[PDB]
Design a protein around this ligand. Structure first.
Ligand SMILES: Cc1ccc(C(=O)Nc2ccc(CN3CCN(C)CC3)c(C(F)(F)F)c2)cc1C#Cc1cnc2cccnn12
Length: 297
């Protein structure tokens, strides 16, 4: 690999820490970095480091290099996980990115569900959970802003889901993945992850049936992500196995309106799931629509 002085970071300024997850596309580890800002060479910061698994092949390495190159090109935005540096010289390939201290959006919501009626009232805020409507709307708005930026850079995500949105210490939403060379020509549609996820449930129909991905396919997934947010991390198409999902999508089945969700937001969900990709909103329109809701509250 050639040395790119713009992005290269000395590997000896990293102290690797706890693994944050392994996947098909490598492994991600928490690390401490010293002097990420060259103006403060001894300053510590917490970053995340992507690297190859133990017995990885050439395709795996090419896949990670491909990811590195895409991230260089994408540039910086508040609502995406940003590239910080790379280690390409004299040792294993490292791709260094921002660390989002609160983990992924799905787990963030599920850990913050309101207290149930089993509660015994204790103090003046027994009924008040950590999550409020305007903050949920702000989460959706931020994801839409990041997706609008990604679309402007001609980037199609292809697995937009709450699992792939990360949450910073300041509750800022950051689109990640946790994928890139997604192998769209050999998806196991029946795949269930170790946490029980069925990723086929986020795919637009034209992607699933016709293997066509566009920015409007990501808009479909965003609708699913909106449903995730307003169910506080619920699993889509509850109780529906993959075999039945296929036939229900062919009949044009859509998820019901979830409890305690205003019609404005179920309205947006159903717009995102219009059969014709051209009749779904663009991310620009979703940003504007959610902004209006945010201002009203
Ligand atoms: C180490 C690391 C390396 C890489 C990436 C990464 O997200 N790369 C990325 C690859 C592709 C794309 C877009 N493509 C999609 C596919 N597609 C078909 C083409 C274009 C994007 C996108 F954001 F632009 F979408 C990002 C994230 C991390 C992390 C981390 C981290 C920080 N805090 C925590 C806390 C808990 C867990 N993890 N974690």
């Amino acid at each position: 690999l050639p040395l790119d002085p713009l992005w290269e970071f000395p590997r000896d300024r990293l102290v690797l820490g706890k693994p944050l997850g392994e996947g098909a596309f490598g492994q991600v580890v928490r690390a401490e970095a010293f002097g990420m800002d060259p103006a403060r060479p001894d300053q510590a910061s917490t970053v995340a480091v992507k690297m190859l698994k133990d017995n990885a092949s050439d395709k795996d390495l090419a896949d990670l290099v491909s990811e590195m190159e895409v991230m260089k090109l994408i540039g910086r935005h508040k609502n995406i996980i940003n590239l910080l540096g790379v280690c390409t010289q004299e040792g294993p390939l490292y791709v260094i990115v921002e660390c989002a201290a609160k983990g992924n959006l799905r787990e963030f919501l599920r850990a913050r569900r309101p207290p149930g009626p089993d509660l015994s009232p204790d103090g003046p805020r027994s009924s008040e959970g950590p999550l409020s409507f305007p903050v949920l709307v702000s989460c959706a708005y931020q994801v839409a802003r990041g997706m609008q930026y990604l679309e402007s850079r001609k980037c199609i995500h292809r697995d937009l889901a709450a699992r792939n949105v990360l949450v910073t210490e300041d509750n800022v939403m950051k689109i990640a993945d946790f994928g890139l060379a997604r192998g769209v020509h050999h998806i196991d549609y029946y795949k269930k992850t170790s946490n029980g996820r069925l990723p086929v449930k986020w795919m637009a129909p034209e992607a699933l049936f016709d293997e066509v991905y566009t920015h409007q396919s990501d808009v479909w997934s965003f609708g699913i992500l909106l449903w995730e947010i307003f169910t506080l991390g619920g699993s889509p198409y509850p109780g529906i196995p993959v075999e039945e999902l296929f036939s229900l999508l062919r009949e044009g089945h859509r998820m019901d309106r979830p409890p305690h969700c205003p019609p404005e937001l179920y309205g947006l969900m159903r717009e995102c799931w219009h059969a014709a990709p051209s009749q779904r909103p663009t991310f620009k329109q979703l940003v504007e629509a959610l902004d209006k809701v945010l201002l009203a509250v």
